[PDB]
Structure formats: structure tokens, C-alpha cells
């Protein structure tokens, strides 16, 4: 059986750069996947998209649009201290949070900072 | 000017018992009120409701219906370890989280537990 850590490693293996918004999307997919006992179907979808010739980035986005736990889903809230806790390669992807953000519309997660500031990570 | 702690103490002084769902609603009102620089209007609405003869419980609900930061607002996510971090008097008000919980519909907050469990506090 595949673990959340295994799936993270598999997905990271295909991504360029490091600490990018796509790496964070992997984290979200793995966390929500684990919490919904869906790591296997998610892995199968990822591999199937790659096998069709999709970019790994598109494979991750297709998971958000095809696997039902992400469809019309609000992004998870992640509590952190400051913007400094977020990798450099994610910084320019941070945005003010819109009213109903949705994972399948590119809103990966919402970071809540210790002083109450709130930023959404957008792809 | 009134602080979030001052307001919390004022509201607690009107509520019977301790650690109830209404005490948690005070916490949410004061935190969100502080983050939106809205403690003054919140206090004014609370006092006005009491002055019309409303119960302090209803005055708190009135705040969620009358102060625009709570109108059609999703409940805040609060990260905790387990149900053991929630006071005894709130336990029976914890519910599975519905698709679109709203503060002004009685969904005070969403507790996210460390193992991935999620519970909404409902009034
Ligand atoms: C930039 C940053 C700061 C702080 C946290 C994170 C982050 O995404 C996560 C972790 O540091 C982490 O350990 N997460 C995680 C991912 C999958 C599992 C499933 C498992 O292996 O048991 C567990 C933890 C990340 C994480 C991802 C999400 Cl969606 C979270 C979260 C943490 O808390 C609330 O929602 C990212
Ligand atoms: C049952 C339980 C467990 C853990 C936290 C709480 C809770 O509601 C909060 C606190 O322990 C706390 O210190 N909060 C709080 C309330 C107002 C302010 C404004 C200020 O005086 O600076 C600051 C902190 C409570 C709290 C309320 C909300 Cl809505 C929160 C939250 C914490 O984290 C994210 O969203 C309640």
C-alpha cells in the first residue's frame, strides 16, 4: 500500500524546481487524499495522465478536476507564523483570498498567518 | 479603545455557565472582529441588542446577522489536537461539517483535528 509520503516522493520526482506552487499542490493532494482514503486512486490518475503524455503539472491539475474529493472543494487552511515559512518559489503565487476559492479553480490552499493575515496560493 | 480581550471579557460576563458553544462564539466574534478592525461596531450591536431586551445569546447571534464581516461568511478553521482540546460543554454541539457552513447559519467554527478529522461547532 502506498503511503502519503510515498505519493509525495513520486510526484516530487516529476516536478522541476523546488518549493514551487506545484510542490504545495502535491502536499494538499496528499493530505486530503490520505484523509479520504484516496491515495490509490489519486496515484492511478497521476500515472494515467503521465502515460497519456501530459506534463506532470497538468497531471496534478487534472487530479483536482477529476477526483471527486477536489471537485467544488474549498482549499484547506494551513496555519503558519509568517510569510517566511513559505518557500521562495511560492511567494509570487500568494494572493488575497477571494470569496469562494475552489481547489479545482487553482486555489491550492489558504495560509493563515499568526497576526491574522490570510493569503491564498494560486496556480 | 476596546481590545479584543476586553470585549471577550464583557461578553463572557453576560453568559451563563462556562466553556459553552456561546463562549466559543464570543472567541470567534472577537478574533474575526479584531482582524477586521470591527470591535467597535460589534460592541455597539451587542449593547443595542441587550438594550432592546434580547438574551445575551440572541445578542451574539444578532451580531452574526447584522455585522457584515459575518454575513455569508465561512466559519474560521481552528487547528487542535483532538476533541480533548474542546471544553466539555461544547462537545454535544460538535457535528460533521456540511458542504457550505456559514457563521450566520450557526456554524461557529470548524475544528481541524491533528489526524485529519474535522468537526463543526453548531448553534
Ligand atoms: C509552506 C507550508 C508550511 C507549513 C505546512 C505546509 C504543508 O503543506 C504541510 C506540512 O508541513 C505537512 O507535514 N503536511 C502534511 C501533508 C500530508 C500529511 C498526511 C500524512 O502523511 O499523514 C500530513 C501532513 C502539509 C499539510 C498539508 C495540508 Cl492540506 C494541511 C496541513 C499540512 O495542515 C492542515 O492542512 C506547508
Ligand atoms: C476550543 C479551542 C481550542 C483552541 C483554540 C480556541 C480558540 O477559539 C482561540 C484561542 O485559544 C485563542 O487565543 N483565540 C483568539 C481569540 C481572539 C484573538 C484576538 C486577540 O486578542 O489578539 C486571538 C486569539 C481563539 C481563536 C479564535 C479563532 Cl476564530 C481562531 C483562532 C483562535 O485561530 C484561528 O482562528 C478554542
Swiss-Prot record, chains A, B:
The chain holds residues 218 to 340 of 340 of the full protein. Its main location: virion. This is Polymerase cofactor VP35. The interferon inhibitory domain (IID) binds dsRNA. One of its GO terms (biological process) is symbiont-mediated suppression of host RNAi-mediated antiviral immune response. Changing residue 95 to A: Complete loss of IRF3 promoter inhibition; dsRNA-binding and interaction with host PRKRA. It comes from the Viruses. It is found in: Virion; Host cytoplasm. The gene is VP35. There is a cross-link at residue 92 (Glycyl lysine isopeptide (Lys-Gly) (interchain with G-Cter in ubiquitin)). It comes from Zaire ebolavirus (strain Mayinga-76). The lineage of its organism: Viruses, Riboviria, Orthornavirae, Negarnaviricota, Haploviricotina.
Amino acid at each position: 500500500d502506498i503511503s502519503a509520503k510515498d505519493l509525495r516522493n513520486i510526484m516530487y520526482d516529476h516536478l522541476p524546481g523546488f518549493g514551487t506552487a506545484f510542490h504545495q499542490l502535491v502536499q494538499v493532494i496528499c493530505k486530503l487524499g490520505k484523509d479520504s482514503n484516496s491515495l490509490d486512486i489519486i496515484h492511478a490518475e497521476f500515472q494515467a495522465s503521465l502515460a497519456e503524455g501530459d506534463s506532470p503539472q497538468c497531471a496534478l491539475i487534472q487530479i483536482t478536476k477529476r477526483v471527486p474529493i477536489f471537485q467544488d472543494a474549498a482549499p484547506p487552511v494551513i496555519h503558519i507564523r509568517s510569510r517566511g515559512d513559505i518557500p521562495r518559489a511560492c511567494q509570487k503565487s500568494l494572493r488575497p483570498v477571494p470569496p469562494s476559492p475552489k481547489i479545482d479553480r487553482g486555489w491550492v490552499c489558504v495560509f493563515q498567518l499568526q497576526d491574522g493575515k490570510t493569503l491564498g496560493l494560486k496556480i
